[PDB]
Every structure is written in C-alpha cells, then in structure tokens.
Design a protein around this ligand. Structure first.
Ligand SMILES: OC[C@H]1O[C@@H](S[C@H]2[C@H](O)[C@@H](O)[C@H](S[C@H]3[C@H](O)[C@@H](O)[C@H](S)O[C@@H]3CO)O[C@@H]2CO)[C@H](O)[C@@H](O)[C@@H]1S
Ligand SMILES: *[C@@H]1O[C@H](CO)[C@@H](O)[C@H](O)[C@H]1NC(C)=O
Ligand SMILES: *[C@@H]1O[C@H](CO)[C@@H](O)[C@H](O)[C@H]1NC(C)=O
Length: 398
C-alpha cells in the first residue's frame, strides 16, 4: 500500500545495551504499529482484503494497481493511543480494548532513525524485560517475541513496495498465514508469509510459554501449497516450555502460592547459549521478583532430560518433531544470528481460547473462562505492560 501524507507520530521507547564491564546504557528506540492497524483503504472507503485472504481483486488485479489503489493512513499520537499503544520512559503499554473497541495491538521496535527495524542478534547473548501481567486472565496472550522480518519492511524487494519499516510493513511468522500484503506489496499469489520465529514470552497471569520456531528458509518466504503446511518449511508448533506441562504447577501463577507471582511485577531474563562454533545450543530462563533470582524448575515428568532449559535433547524427548526436522536449535540460532525484529502484542482467540497456553496440562483454566465473552467479565479491560528491555552480554542485563 502507499502511505498517505499524514504525520506518523511513533511513540518513543527507551531500551538498554549492556556489558559486564560498563553496565546498561540507554538507547532511543521507537515503537511502530503493524501496517494493518494504520488503516489500509481504497478511496471509496472499502478495504483492501482480509487476514487469511489475498487482496481486493478489483483494487489489486496486479501489484502496481494494488500499490496505487490501497492507501495507508499515517498514525499520529491519538491514533496510537486509540489503537491501544502508549509508551512512557522505558515502558510500553498495550491495551486490548479501547472504548469497547477490540484494538489488539501488534507493534515492532524501530531503530532511532525510524527507517529500519532495530535488528537483534540474540545467539550468545542475554535478553531481559520487566512485565506487568496482572490484568491478563485466562484466554489472553501478552506476547513478547521475534520474527525474521525484512529490516526495511520489504521496501527493496519491489518498485511498488512503499510502506517500509516506518509504517509497520513486512510482518511474517512461523504460522505461514496468507495475508493480503507480503513485503509491503499486494499478495496477489496468495502465499503464506513465513519466517523463523522466537517466542520468548507468550502468557497470561495463569500460564507462561517459551518457544523457538525454526524454519528451513532464511528471511521472509512466500510459501506455496505444502510449503505452508505442518510438514512444510516452518515448525508451526515450536519446541515449547511451560512449567505446567513439565509438571511443576506451582512455579508461575496468581498469588503467594507460586514461585513467580503473576499479580506483581517481575523480571524475565532469557539466555541464548552458544557452543564454541557460535551455534545456539541451549535456551535458559530465570526470573527476578523481590530482588530474588527465581531459577527455572527442572523437568518433573519422565522422558525429557532432567534440566531447566531448552536444548535439542529436550525438544526431541518432548515430541517437537518439526522443530528437530527443520534443524532444531542450531537452525533457530542461525536466524537469531542474522538478526530478528522485536514484536510485542496483546490478543485473545475466539477459536480455541488460548487453550494451548492455559488449560489441561498447560494450566489451570477451564474450557470456557478463556472465551473472549467471559474474559471481559473477569477483566473488563485486559492489558499488559512490557518495560525496561535490556539486551547485552550474558550476566549483565538483570
Ligand atoms: O493472528 C493471531 C495472533 O497471532 C499472534 S502471532 C503468534 C505466532 O503466530 C506464533 O508463531 C506464536 S503463537 C503460537 C505459539 O508460539 C506456539 O507455541 C503455539 S503451539 O501455537 C501458538 C498459536 O498460533 O507467537 C506469535 C505471538 O503470539 C500475534 O502476536 C497477534 O497479534 C495475532 S491477533
Ligand atoms: C473489493 O472492493 C470492491 C470495491 O472496489 C468492493 O465492491 C468489494 O466488496 C471488495 N470485495 C470484498 C470481498 O470485500
Ligand atoms: C507430577 O509430579 C508429582 C509430584 O511433584 C507426582 O506426584 C506425579 O506423579 C507427577 N506426574 C507424572 C506424570 O510424573
């Protein structure tokens, strides 16, 4: 789509780069709403296509026509605020609803110039954030994750690609979903938009999940047919780690009866460990609440190695077949070494209610309190605040 002339006022976010020897240093970074949330319309006010579908056929018979007919509205400060996005110092607040409107924001981190996404190379490094999870009941998902999206939003791929990173273009992930735009251009062939993805944090106040999703093609890839499927080029499932699935159900939850108390603020430190050859071999996690290092808990079911981190032995043992088949931890770390885009969102699901995250062996929720219609009864205004993001040498962020 072709950006209109309206001013874009990206919310400011302070983030930190750290070293054992110098500590953490402040950086100016910007937050950008997905291209979609900006508003992509035809002049007659019609839209240019729906998630899961290719673009308007009349507006986008071809790429150039699509580029001309679909206009993207710039988002100013109030636009950002009505989309549920706000920042303060080093805090980012994402609200799920604004004035009874489902806004469910997805935002990406920009470099200080606003023209490129801040690309993060996490293999061999450490990543930490603080999160405020209390206002997230069952069924909700406050996600902090990375996707191997084009740094420029796709702009260099075509003459017609105009939105760029500056307006939130070029999203992808390991689901390979068919979206109306690929790389900032009409997705005329209706391909799935794929790419390696690292889910550092997917949670609500009742359950958390960690999950690397490797893909066999580098960067953003428009899959076709089977390339998009279960045995396709991406690991749709991922190799997850939920303390409730490895039988340690008192590790994370609301209240004093849990090691990490989801009703209060806490720090989430993740450590991506590399071998001598520079390949990712293991993913470590530890928390900080009340000035206390809360170590992750060992596997408490028979099968997996008795460890408290992700590695290929664990993933293999836990039935992460596609993960292992598409290259496992080394493949994921190669995307992490090339550089990935930080994505942050708030969402819920009318289709399965996030059951994979907080029901059965995943958590303490029943089969209906996660329903979006029930979620607003429990918590009328679901939200999440991620803050104090600091990337740096292992041992210096938390
Ligand atoms: O459009 C829906 C919603 O999607 C998330 S993106 C989601 C990715 O698609 C996915 O790769 C993961 S969610 C995924 C878990 O990672 C995986 O372990 C399990 S088994 O399957 C779930 C469900 O697909 O991570 C991201 C982040 O959640 C967007 O963030 C939302 O904005 C939109 S509304
Ligand atoms: C495509 O846009 C045209 C107008 O240009 C509109 O009449 C039609 O409904 C659109 N198709 C869909 C599925 O929305
Ligand atoms: C889960 O752990 C509890 C004790 O911590 C144990 O009693 C139970 O048998 C375990 N479940 C499995 C399947 O191992």
């Amino acid at each position: 789509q072709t950006p209109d002339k309206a001013k874009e006022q990206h919310p400011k976010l302070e983030t930190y780069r750290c070293t054992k020897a110098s500590g953490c240093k402040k950086q100016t970074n910007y937050i950008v709403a997905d291209a979609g949330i900006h508003g992509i319309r035809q002049k007659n006010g019609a839209g240019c296509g729906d998630w899961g579908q290719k673009p308007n056929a009349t507006a986008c018979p071809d790429e150039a026509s699509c580029a001309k007919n679909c206009i993207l509205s710039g988002m100013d400060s109030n636009a950002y605020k009505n989309a549920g996005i706000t920042t303060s110092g080093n805090k980012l607040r994402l609200q799920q609803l604004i004035n009874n409107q489902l806004v469910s924001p997805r935002v990406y981190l920009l470099e200080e110039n606003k023209k490129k996404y801040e690309m993060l190379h996490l293999t061999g490094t450490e990543f930490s954030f603080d999160v405020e999870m209390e206002k997230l009941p069952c069924g909700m998902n406050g996600a902090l994750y990375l996707s191997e999206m084009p740094q420029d939003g796709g702009k260099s791929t075509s003459r017609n690609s105009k939105a760029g990173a500056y307006y939130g273009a070029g999203y992808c992930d390991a689901q390979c979903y068919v979206t109306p735009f690929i790389n900032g251009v009409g997705n005329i062939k209706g391909q799935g938009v794929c790419c390696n993805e690292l889910d550092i944090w997917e949670a609500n106040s009742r359950a958390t999940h960690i999950a690397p999703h490797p893909c066999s093609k580098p960067g953003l890839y428009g899959c076709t047919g089977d390339e998009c499927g279960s045995s396709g080029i991406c690991d749709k499932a991922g190799c997850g780690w939920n303390h409730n699935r490895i039988n340690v159900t008192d590790f994370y939850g609301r209240g004093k009866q849990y090691k990490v108390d989801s009703t209060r603020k806490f720090t989430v430190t993740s450590q991506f460990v590399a071998n001598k050859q520079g390949d990712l071999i293991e993913l470590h996690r530890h928390y900080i609440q009340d000035n206390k290092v809360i170590e992750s808990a060992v596997v408490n079911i028979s099968g997996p190695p008795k460890i408290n981190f992700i590695n290929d032995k664990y993933c293999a043992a836990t039935g992460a077949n596609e993960y292992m088949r598409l290259g496992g931890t080394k493949q994921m770390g190669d995307a992490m070494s090339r550089g990935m885009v930080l994505a942050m969102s708030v969402w819920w699901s009318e289709g399965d209610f996030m059951a994979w995250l907080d029901q059965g062996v995943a958590g303490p929720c029943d089969a209906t309190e996660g329903d979006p219609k029930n979620i607003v009864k429990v918590q009328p205004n679901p939200e999440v605040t991620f803050s104090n993001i600091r990337i740096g040498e292992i041992g210096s962020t938390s």
